[PDB]
Coordinates of C-alpha atoms (C1' of nucleotides) in Angstrom, one line a residue:
Chain A
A99 CA 14.0 30.4 -0.6
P100 CA 11.8 30.7 -3.7
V101 CA 8.8 28.3 -3.9
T102 CA 6.5 27.2 -6.7
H103 CA 2.7 27.6 -6.8
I104 CA 1.2 24.1 -6.6
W105 CA -1.6 25.2 -9.0
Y106 CA 0.8 25.4 -11.9
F107 CA 3.0 22.4 -11.0
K108 CA 0.7 19.6 -9.8
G109 CA -2.5 20.9 -11.5
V110 CA -3.2 18.8 -14.6
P111 CA -1.9 19.5 -17.1
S112 CA 1.3 20.7 -15.6
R113 CA 1.8 24.3 -16.8
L114 CA 5.5 24.4 -16.0
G115 CA 6.0 21.0 -17.7
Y116 CA 4.3 22.5 -20.8
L117 CA 6.4 25.7 -20.6
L118 CA 9.8 24.1 -20.1
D119 CA 9.0 20.9 -22.1
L120 CA 9.9 18.9 -18.9
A121 CA 8.1 15.7 -17.9
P122 CA 5.8 15.9 -14.9
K123 CA 7.7 13.3 -12.9
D124 CA 11.1 14.9 -13.7
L125 CA 9.7 18.3 -12.5
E126 CA 8.5 16.6 -9.3
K127 CA 12.0 15.2 -8.8
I128 CA 13.5 18.7 -9.4
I129 CA 11.2 20.7 -7.1
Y130 CA 11.4 18.4 -4.0
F131 CA 15.1 17.9 -4.0
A132 CA 15.4 14.4 -5.6
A133 CA 17.4 15.3 -8.7
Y134 CA 19.7 18.2 -9.7
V135 CA 19.0 20.1 -13.0
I136 CA 21.6 21.8 -15.3
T137 CA 20.8 25.5 -15.6
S138 CA 23.7 26.4 -17.9
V139 CA 26.9 24.9 -19.4
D140 CA 29.8 26.8 -21.0
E141 CA 29.9 24.8 -24.2
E142 CA 32.7 26.8 -25.8
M143 CA 35.0 26.5 -22.8
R144 CA 34.2 22.7 -22.8
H145 CA 35.2 22.5 -26.4
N146 CA 38.4 24.5 -25.9
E147 CA 39.4 22.1 -23.0
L148 CA 37.9 18.8 -24.2
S149 CA 41.3 17.3 -25.3
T150 CA 43.0 18.0 -22.0
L151 CA 40.1 16.6 -19.9
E152 CA 39.9 13.6 -22.1
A153 CA 43.6 12.8 -21.7
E154 CA 43.3 13.2 -18.0
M155 CA 40.3 10.9 -17.8
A156 CA 42.1 8.3 -19.9
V157 CA 45.1 8.5 -17.6
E158 CA 42.9 8.0 -14.6
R159 CA 41.2 5.0 -16.1
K160 CA 44.6 3.5 -17.1
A161 CA 45.8 4.0 -13.5
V162 CA 42.7 2.2 -12.2
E163 CA 43.2 -0.7 -14.5
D164 CA 46.9 -1.0 -13.6
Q165 CA 46.1 -1.0 -9.9
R166 CA 43.4 -3.7 -10.5
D167 CA 45.8 -5.9 -12.5
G168 CA 48.6 -5.6 -9.9
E169 CA 46.3 -6.4 -7.0
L170 CA 44.8 -9.4 -8.9
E171 CA 48.3 -10.7 -9.7
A172 CA 49.3 -10.4 -6.0
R173 CA 46.2 -12.3 -4.9
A174 CA 46.5 -15.0 -7.5
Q175 CA 50.2 -15.6 -6.6
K176 CA 49.3 -15.7 -2.9
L177 CA 46.6 -18.3 -3.7
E178 CA 48.9 -20.5 -5.7
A179 CA 51.6 -20.3 -3.0
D180 CA 49.0 -21.1 -0.3
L181 CA 47.8 -24.1 -2.2
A182 CA 51.4 -25.3 -2.7
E183 CA 52.0 -24.8 1.1
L184 CA 48.9 -26.8 2.1
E185 CA 50.0 -29.5 -0.4
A186 CA 53.4 -29.7 1.4
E187 CA 51.4 -30.1 4.6
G188 CA 49.7 -33.0 3.1
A189 CA 46.1 -31.8 3.5
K190 CA 43.3 -33.5 1.6
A191 CA 42.6 -32.2 -1.9
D192 CA 39.1 -31.2 -0.9
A193 CA 40.4 -28.7 1.6
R194 CA 42.6 -27.4 -1.2
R195 CA 39.5 -27.0 -3.3
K196 CA 37.9 -25.0 -0.5
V197 CA 40.9 -22.7 -0.4
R198 CA 40.8 -22.5 -4.2
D199 CA 37.2 -21.5 -4.4
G200 CA 37.9 -18.9 -1.7
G201 CA 40.7 -17.4 -3.7
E202 CA 38.6 -17.3 -6.9
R203 CA 35.8 -15.6 -4.9
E204 CA 38.3 -13.0 -3.6
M205 CA 39.7 -12.4 -7.1
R206 CA 36.2 -12.0 -8.5
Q207 CA 35.4 -9.4 -5.7
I208 CA 38.6 -7.4 -6.6
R209 CA 37.8 -7.4 -10.3
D210 CA 34.2 -6.3 -9.7
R211 CA 35.3 -3.5 -7.3
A212 CA 37.6 -2.2 -10.0
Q213 CA 34.9 -2.6 -12.7
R214 CA 32.5 -0.5 -10.7
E215 CA 35.0 2.3 -10.5
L216 CA 35.7 2.1 -14.2
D217 CA 31.9 2.3 -14.9
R218 CA 31.6 5.3 -12.7
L219 CA 34.4 7.1 -14.6
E220 CA 32.7 6.1 -17.9
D221 CA 29.4 7.6 -16.7
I222 CA 31.1 10.8 -15.4
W223 CA 32.8 11.4 -18.7
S224 CA 29.7 10.5 -20.7
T225 CA 27.6 12.9 -18.7
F226 CA 30.0 15.8 -18.9
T227 CA 30.5 15.3 -22.6
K228 CA 26.7 15.4 -23.4
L229 CA 25.8 18.1 -20.8
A230 CA 23.1 20.6 -21.8
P231 CA 20.6 22.8 -19.9
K232 CA 17.4 21.3 -18.5
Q233 CA 19.1 17.9 -18.1
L234 CA 18.4 16.0 -14.9
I235 CA 20.9 14.1 -12.7
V236 CA 19.1 11.8 -10.3
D237 CA 22.3 10.4 -8.8
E238 CA 23.7 12.8 -6.2
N239 CA 27.2 11.2 -6.1
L240 CA 27.4 11.6 -9.9
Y241 CA 26.5 15.3 -9.6
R242 CA 29.0 15.7 -6.8
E243 CA 31.8 14.2 -8.9
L244 CA 30.7 16.5 -11.8
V245 CA 31.1 19.5 -9.6
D246 CA 34.3 18.3 -8.1
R247 CA 35.9 17.8 -11.6
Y248 CA 34.3 20.1 -14.2
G249 CA 32.6 22.6 -12.0
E250 CA 34.1 25.5 -13.9
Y251 CA 32.2 24.5 -17.0
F252 CA 28.6 24.1 -16.0
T253 CA 26.1 25.4 -13.4
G254 CA 23.4 23.3 -11.8
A255 CA 20.8 23.6 -9.0
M256 CA 18.0 21.9 -7.2
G257 CA 14.6 22.7 -5.8
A258 CA 12.4 25.6 -6.9
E259 CA 15.2 28.2 -7.3
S260 CA 16.5 26.1 -10.1
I261 CA 13.2 26.3 -12.0
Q262 CA 13.2 30.0 -11.3
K263 CA 16.5 30.2 -13.0
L264 CA 15.3 28.0 -15.9
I265 CA 12.3 30.4 -16.4
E266 CA 14.7 33.3 -16.4
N267 CA 17.0 31.6 -19.0
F268 CA 14.0 30.9 -21.3
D269 CA 13.4 32.6 -24.6
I270 CA 9.6 32.9 -24.9
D271 CA 9.4 34.1 -28.5
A272 CA 12.0 31.5 -29.7
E273 CA 10.2 28.6 -28.1
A274 CA 6.9 29.9 -29.3
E275 CA 8.1 30.0 -32.9
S276 CA 9.7 26.6 -32.6
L277 CA 6.4 25.2 -31.5
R278 CA 4.8 27.0 -34.4
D279 CA 7.3 25.5 -36.8
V280 CA 6.5 22.1 -35.5
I281 CA 2.7 22.9 -35.8
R282 CA 2.8 24.2 -39.4
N283 CA 4.1 20.8 -40.7
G284 CA 4.1 17.8 -38.4
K285 CA 2.6 14.4 -37.6
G286 CA -0.5 14.6 -35.5
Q287 CA 0.8 12.1 -33.0
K288 CA 3.6 14.5 -32.2
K289 CA 1.8 17.6 -33.3
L290 CA -1.1 17.6 -30.7
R291 CA 1.4 17.6 -27.9
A292 CA 3.0 20.7 -29.4
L293 CA -0.4 22.4 -30.0
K294 CA -1.2 22.3 -26.3
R295 CA 2.3 23.5 -25.5
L296 CA 1.7 26.5 -27.7
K297 CA -1.6 27.1 -26.0
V298 CA 0.4 27.5 -22.8
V299 CA 3.3 29.5 -24.2
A300 CA 1.5 32.0 -26.4
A301 CA -0.5 33.2 -23.4
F302 CA 2.7 34.3 -21.6
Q303 CA 4.0 35.7 -25.0
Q304 CA 1.0 37.9 -25.9
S305 CA -0.3 38.9 -22.5
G306 CA 2.9 40.6 -21.3
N307 CA 3.0 39.0 -17.9
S308 CA 6.1 37.0 -17.1
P309 CA 5.9 33.3 -16.3
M310 CA 8.1 34.1 -13.3
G311 CA 4.9 34.6 -11.3
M312 CA 4.6 30.8 -11.1
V313 CA 7.6 30.8 -8.7
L314 CA 6.9 32.8 -5.5
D315 CA 9.3 34.8 -3.3
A316 CA 6.6 36.0 -0.9
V317 CA 3.3 34.5 0.0
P318 CA 0.2 36.7 0.9
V319 CA -1.6 36.3 4.2
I320 CA -5.4 36.6 4.1
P321 CA -6.8 39.1 6.6
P322 CA -7.5 37.7 10.1
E323 CA -11.3 38.1 10.1
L324 CA -11.5 35.7 7.2
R325 CA -9.6 33.1 9.3
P326 CA -11.0 34.0 12.8
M327 CA -10.0 32.4 16.1
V328 CA -12.9 32.1 18.5
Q329 CA -13.0 31.5 22.2
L330 CA -14.9 28.4 23.5
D331 CA -17.3 28.3 26.5
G332 CA -14.9 25.9 28.2
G333 CA -12.1 28.5 28.3
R334 CA -10.2 26.9 25.4
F335 CA -9.8 28.3 21.9
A336 CA -10.8 27.1 18.4
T337 CA -9.1 28.6 15.3
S338 CA -9.3 28.2 11.6
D339 CA -7.1 25.6 9.7
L340 CA -5.6 28.4 7.6
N341 CA -4.0 29.7 10.8
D342 CA -2.3 26.3 11.3
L343 CA -1.1 26.2 7.6
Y344 CA 0.3 29.8 7.8
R345 CA 1.9 28.9 11.2
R346 CA 3.7 25.8 9.8
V347 CA 4.9 27.9 6.8
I348 CA 6.2 30.5 9.2
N349 CA 7.9 27.9 11.4
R350 CA 9.7 26.2 8.6
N351 CA 10.7 29.5 7.0
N352 CA 12.2 30.8 10.2
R353 CA 14.1 27.5 10.7
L354 CA 15.4 27.8 7.1
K355 CA 16.6 31.3 8.0
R356 CA 18.4 29.9 11.0
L357 CA 20.1 27.2 8.9
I358 CA 21.2 29.7 6.3
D359 CA 22.7 31.9 9.1
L360 CA 24.5 29.0 10.8
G361 CA 25.9 27.6 7.6
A362 CA 24.4 24.2 8.3
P363 CA 25.3 21.3 6.0
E364 CA 23.6 21.4 2.6
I365 CA 21.7 18.3 3.4
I366 CA 19.8 20.0 6.3
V367 CA 19.2 23.2 4.3
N368 CA 17.9 21.3 1.2
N369 CA 15.7 19.0 3.3
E370 CA 14.3 22.1 5.0
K371 CA 13.6 23.9 1.7
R372 CA 11.7 20.8 0.6
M373 CA 9.5 21.1 3.7
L374 CA 8.9 24.8 3.1
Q375 CA 7.8 23.9 -0.4
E376 CA 5.4 21.3 0.9
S377 CA 4.1 23.8 3.5
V378 CA 3.3 26.4 0.9
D379 CA 1.7 23.6 -1.2
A380 CA -0.5 22.7 1.8
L381 CA -1.4 26.3 2.4
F382 CA -2.6 26.8 -1.1
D383 CA -4.1 23.4 -1.9
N384 CA -3.6 20.8 0.8
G385 CA -3.9 17.2 -0.4
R386 CA -3.2 18.1 -4.1
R387 CA 0.2 16.3 -4.0
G388 CA 0.6 13.2 -1.8
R389 CA -1.2 12.8 1.4
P390 CA -2.9 15.8 3.0
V391 CA -1.7 17.4 6.2
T392 CA -3.9 15.9 8.8
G393 CA -5.0 17.8 11.9
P394 CA -6.1 16.3 15.3
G395 CA -8.0 13.2 14.6
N396 CA -6.7 12.4 11.1
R397 CA -8.8 15.2 9.6
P398 CA -7.4 16.9 6.5
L399 CA -7.0 20.6 7.0
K400 CA -8.9 22.9 4.7
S401 CA -6.7 25.0 2.4
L402 CA -7.3 28.4 0.7
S403 CA -8.5 26.7 -2.5
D404 CA -10.9 24.7 -0.4
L405 CA -12.7 28.0 0.3
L406 CA -13.9 28.0 -3.3
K407 CA -14.4 24.3 -4.2
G408 CA -17.7 22.4 -4.7
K409 CA -21.1 22.9 -3.0
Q410 CA -19.5 24.2 0.2
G411 CA -17.2 26.6 -1.6
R412 CA -17.7 30.4 -1.6
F413 CA -19.3 30.5 -5.1
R414 CA -22.2 28.0 -4.7
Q415 CA -22.7 28.5 -1.0
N416 CA -22.5 32.3 -0.6
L417 CA -22.8 33.8 -4.1
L418 CA -25.2 31.7 -6.2
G419 CA -27.5 31.3 -3.2
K420 CA -27.8 33.3 0.0
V422 CA -32.2 36.3 3.1
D423 CA -34.1 38.6 5.5
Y424 CA -37.9 39.1 5.6
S425 CA -38.6 35.4 5.2
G426 CA -40.2 32.6 7.1
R427 CA -41.4 29.0 6.8
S428 CA -44.1 26.7 8.2
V429 CA -46.2 23.6 7.6
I430 CA -48.7 23.8 4.8
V431 CA -52.4 23.1 5.1
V432 CA -55.1 22.8 2.4
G433 CA -57.5 25.7 2.2
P434 CA -60.5 25.0 0.1
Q435 CA -62.3 28.3 0.7
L436 CA -59.4 30.3 -0.5
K437 CA -59.4 31.8 -4.0
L438 CA -56.7 30.9 -6.5
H439 CA -54.9 34.2 -6.0
Chain B
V4 CA 41.7 22.1 3.6
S5 CA 38.4 22.4 1.7
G6 CA 38.1 18.6 1.7
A7 CA 38.2 18.8 5.5
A8 CA 35.1 21.0 5.3
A9 CA 33.4 18.7 2.8
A10 CA 34.0 15.6 5.0
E11 CA 31.7 17.1 7.7
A12 CA 28.9 17.4 5.2
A13 CA 29.5 13.8 4.0
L14 CA 29.3 12.7 7.7
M15 CA 26.1 14.5 8.3
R16 CA 24.6 13.0 5.1
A17 CA 25.7 9.5 6.3
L18 CA 24.0 9.9 9.7
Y19 CA 21.0 11.2 7.8
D20 CA 20.8 8.1 5.6
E21 CA 21.2 5.8 8.6
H22 CA 18.8 7.5 11.2
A23 CA 16.4 10.0 9.7
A24 CA 13.6 7.6 8.7
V25 CA 13.6 5.7 11.9
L26 CA 13.6 8.9 14.0
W27 CA 10.7 10.1 11.8
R28 CA 8.8 6.9 12.6
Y29 CA 9.4 7.4 16.4
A30 CA 8.4 11.0 16.4
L31 CA 5.4 10.1 14.2
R32 CA 4.2 7.7 16.9
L33 CA 4.7 10.2 19.7
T34 CA 2.9 13.0 17.9
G35 CA 0.6 11.4 15.3
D36 CA 1.2 14.3 12.9
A37 CA 3.7 13.6 10.1
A38 CA 4.4 17.3 9.4
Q39 CA 5.4 17.6 13.1
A40 CA 7.6 14.5 12.9
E41 CA 9.5 16.1 10.0
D42 CA 10.1 19.2 12.2
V43 CA 11.3 17.1 15.1
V44 CA 13.7 15.2 12.8
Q45 CA 15.2 18.4 11.4
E46 CA 15.7 19.9 14.9
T47 CA 17.1 16.7 16.3
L48 CA 19.7 16.3 13.5
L49 CA 20.5 20.0 13.8
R50 CA 21.3 19.5 17.5
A51 CA 23.3 16.4 16.4
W52 CA 25.4 18.6 14.1
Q53 CA 25.9 21.1 16.9
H54 CA 27.3 18.4 19.2
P55 CA 30.5 16.8 17.9
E56 CA 30.7 14.6 21.0
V57 CA 27.7 12.6 19.7
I58 CA 29.1 12.3 16.2
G59 CA 32.7 11.4 17.3
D60 CA 32.3 8.0 18.7
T61 CA 30.9 5.6 16.1
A62 CA 31.4 2.6 18.4
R63 CA 28.7 4.1 20.6
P64 CA 25.0 4.2 19.4
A65 CA 24.0 7.8 18.5
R66 CA 20.5 6.5 17.7
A67 CA 19.5 6.4 21.4
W68 CA 20.7 10.0 21.9
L69 CA 18.6 11.0 18.9
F70 CA 15.5 9.3 20.3
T71 CA 16.0 10.9 23.7
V72 CA 16.4 14.4 22.2
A73 CA 13.3 13.9 20.1
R74 CA 11.3 12.7 23.1
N75 CA 12.3 15.8 25.1
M76 CA 11.4 18.0 22.2
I77 CA 8.0 16.4 21.8
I78 CA 7.1 16.6 25.5
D79 CA 8.2 20.3 25.4
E80 CA 5.7 20.9 22.5
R81 CA 3.0 19.3 24.7
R82 CA 2.7 22.3 27.2
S83 CA 0.8 25.6 27.4
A84 CA 0.8 26.8 23.8
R85 CA -0.7 23.5 22.7
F86 CA -2.7 23.2 25.9
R87 CA -5.0 26.1 25.2
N88 CA -5.3 26.3 21.4
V89 CA -5.0 22.7 20.0
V90 CA -8.5 21.8 20.9
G91 CA -10.8 23.1 18.2
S92 CA -11.0 24.0 14.5
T93 CA -13.6 26.3 13.0
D94 CA -13.5 24.2 9.7
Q95 CA -14.3 21.2 11.9
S96 CA -17.9 20.6 12.6
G97 CA -19.3 21.1 16.1
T98 CA -18.1 24.7 16.5
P99 CA -20.6 27.5 16.5
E100 CA -20.0 30.2 13.9
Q101 CA -19.6 33.8 15.0
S102 CA -22.6 36.1 14.6
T103 CA -23.2 39.9 14.9
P104 CA -26.5 41.4 16.0
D105 CA -28.6 43.6 13.7
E106 CA -28.4 47.4 13.8
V107 CA -32.1 47.9 14.2
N108 CA -32.0 49.5 17.7
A109 CA -28.9 51.5 16.8
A110 CA -30.6 52.8 13.6
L111 CA -33.8 53.8 15.4
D112 CA -31.8 55.6 18.1
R113 CA -29.8 57.3 15.4
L114 CA -32.9 58.4 13.6
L115 CA -34.5 59.8 16.8
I116 CA -31.2 61.6 17.7
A117 CA -31.1 63.2 14.2
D118 CA -34.6 64.4 14.6
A119 CA -33.9 65.9 18.0
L120 CA -30.7 67.4 16.6
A121 CA -32.5 69.2 13.8
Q122 CA -34.5 71.2 16.3
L123 CA -31.4 72.7 17.9
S124 CA -29.6 76.0 17.2
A125 CA -26.7 75.9 14.8
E126 CA -24.3 76.7 17.7
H127 CA -25.6 73.9 20.1
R128 CA -25.7 71.4 17.2
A129 CA -22.2 72.3 16.0
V130 CA -21.0 71.9 19.6
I131 CA -22.6 68.5 20.4
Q132 CA -21.5 67.2 17.0
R133 CA -17.9 68.1 17.9
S134 CA -18.0 66.8 21.5
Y135 CA -19.8 63.4 21.0
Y136 CA -19.5 62.7 17.2
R137 CA -15.9 63.8 16.9
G138 CA -14.8 63.1 20.5
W139 CA -12.8 66.3 20.9
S140 CA -11.9 67.9 24.3
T141 CA -13.5 71.0 25.7
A142 CA -10.5 73.1 24.9
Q143 CA -10.3 71.7 21.4
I144 CA -13.8 72.8 20.6
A145 CA -13.1 76.1 22.2
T146 CA -10.1 76.5 19.9
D147 CA -11.9 75.5 16.8
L148 CA -15.1 77.6 17.2
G149 CA -13.1 80.6 18.5
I150 CA -15.2 80.9 21.7
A151 CA -14.4 80.7 25.4
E152 CA -14.0 77.5 27.5
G153 CA -17.0 78.1 29.7
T154 CA -18.9 79.0 26.5
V155 CA -18.4 75.5 25.2
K156 CA -19.2 74.1 28.6
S157 CA -22.5 76.0 28.9
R158 CA -23.5 75.2 25.3
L159 CA -23.0 71.5 25.9
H160 CA -24.9 71.7 29.2
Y161 CA -27.9 73.3 27.6
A162 CA -27.9 71.3 24.4
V163 CA -28.0 68.1 26.3
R164 CA -31.0 69.2 28.3
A165 CA -32.7 70.5 25.1
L166 CA -32.3 67.1 23.4
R167 CA -33.7 65.5 26.6
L168 CA -36.7 67.9 26.3
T169 CA -37.4 66.9 22.7
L170 CA -36.9 63.1 23.4
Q171 CA -39.2 63.2 26.5
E172 CA -41.8 65.1 24.5
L173 CA -41.6 62.3 21.9
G174 CA -41.8 59.6 24.5
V175 CA -38.2 58.3 24.5
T176 CA -37.6 55.9 27.4
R177 CA -35.3 57.1 30.1
Chain C
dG1 C1' 3.1 4.3 -30.2
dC2 C1' -0.7 2.5 -26.4
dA3 C1' -1.9 0.6 -21.6
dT4 C1' -1.7 2.9 -17.1
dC5 C1' -3.3 5.9 -13.7
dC6 C1' -4.6 10.1 -12.1
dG7 C1' -8.4 13.3 -11.0
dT8 C1' -13.1 14.7 -11.7
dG9 C1' -18.0 14.3 -10.7
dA10 C1' -22.0 12.2 -8.1
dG11 C1' -30.5 16.2 -5.4
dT12 C1' -32.6 20.0 -2.5
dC13 C1' -34.7 22.1 2.4
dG14 C1' -35.4 21.0 7.3
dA15 C1' -36.0 21.5 13.4
Chain D
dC1 C1' 18.5 23.7 30.8
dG2 C1' 20.6 18.6 29.2
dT3 C1' 19.7 15.0 26.5
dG4 C1' 23.0 9.6 25.2
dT5 C1' 22.5 0.5 26.2
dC6 C1' 16.2 -2.4 23.2
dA7 C1' 13.8 1.9 22.2
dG8 C1' 10.0 2.6 15.3
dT9 C1' 1.8 5.4 12.3
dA10 C1' -3.2 4.0 12.6
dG11 C1' -5.7 2.9 9.4
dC12 C1' -7.3 0.7 5.7
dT13 C1' -10.5 -0.7 -0.5
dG14 C1' -16.7 -2.4 0.6
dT15 C1' -17.8 3.9 -4.7
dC16 C1' -17.5 4.3 -10.0
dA17 C1' -18.0 6.2 -14.7
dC18 C1' -15.2 8.7 -17.8
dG19 C1' -11.8 11.2 -20.1
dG20 C1' -6.9 12.4 -21.1
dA21 C1' -2.5 13.5 -19.6
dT22 C1' 1.2 10.5 -17.8
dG23 C1' 4.4 6.8 -18.5
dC24 C1' 7.2 1.6 -19.9

DNA sequence: GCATCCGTGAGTCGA
DNA sequence: CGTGTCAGTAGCTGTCACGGATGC
């Protein structure tokens, strides 16, 4: 399953959020299987069938309301009959008040159970009417209903493959010139946010490299001598953390292959793709998003990017400073020595 | 129908929503690694999907079966493969870094061997550089140089002793 | 349109 | 291999200045 490079999603500012004009939290919901996203919608087919679908939705709402009113009438008549019967039995009026409050509670519950269905239908119709690409649907049941009803009209997806599709269905030049039109004449409050977006987009435009590189289909493995596994004098072994990260990536990817072969339920496959995403994220920059993958003893494992960061990174530790033919010893004053 | 196939996915999602987090907490205590607890949860629910006998009866607690399966998985992880490797990390402090010795002795020996090689005939040198530097067989050198088998044998036999002569004349330790 | 919050940095060399 | 009554982290905030993207 495709995966996103954590450097361009979680790294501030979010490069993907600047390219697709998507908010960082919305992108976080998309990648890690918390909200679906609409990749495409056949707007002309929706227009040519809007009247029929509207009539069908109205008929469904009318049927819901009719069922509600019938059930409410039945319950109210049963309540009145029960009160008359308990009056014929001669029970005290306070017990009749108890039965009355119970009946009113039941009728309230029925009316609310119907109103919730009416509101669900209202939201379904409203979402399908105003459906456009790059829209997010955090409610999973709402998206399920949308696919069950108007699945012929739109296409949506989750995870990183959805963002891959969005990058594929993205006009670089058109978005660049739209940002330029906003930049030429605009209010600074809303113009600076477009200036930085253009800074991100014009690079992909001019350079000639596709933004698709931000989503990975294959991940490279560093040669083994740079992540060596040594043997200990006690017979046991000690390996590099990069080996553990690569191993977890491999494990979850093979499990995902098993789930794809077996046709496992979509819940398991999606929850596995999320774990594969987090594993690649830990391999490249562990701890960048959320809590870091801890090894034995609650110690955060070092990532690939950790090989280059700070004073202990490759640059400052092995490039800016390194030597043979050298020594050191305690110093002692020598008055008889000449200055040279 | 197709709804019959969708009902199974709905059922799996329901058992997810009711047991996944608690099973994750249990596996998290037994292992101490959250990334391992997620794997245990995925595998346990996968085995739950493969056993309709556990998902059939709702009046019987499937949570206990899930905990038992997770416990067995976790104890299976705790054997040989973990036994040997799980101990040390190179990034972790307290582990000595690997080192390689210097090539001083090898370079000096190479220099002396080159000097002793220069004082050999073109034939003997071209044979010892094909037997020891290229690692060919006797018949391979005989085929390349267009000479006899015993010829290569004798050339090697003498060139070895000539190099020994030169080295002992220069004081090379036996 | 602005308060919130996230992520960045924080001496060098030693046995 | 099969698995099936409760069965649920350790640890921890005793850093801070500062800037700007992120968010109600």
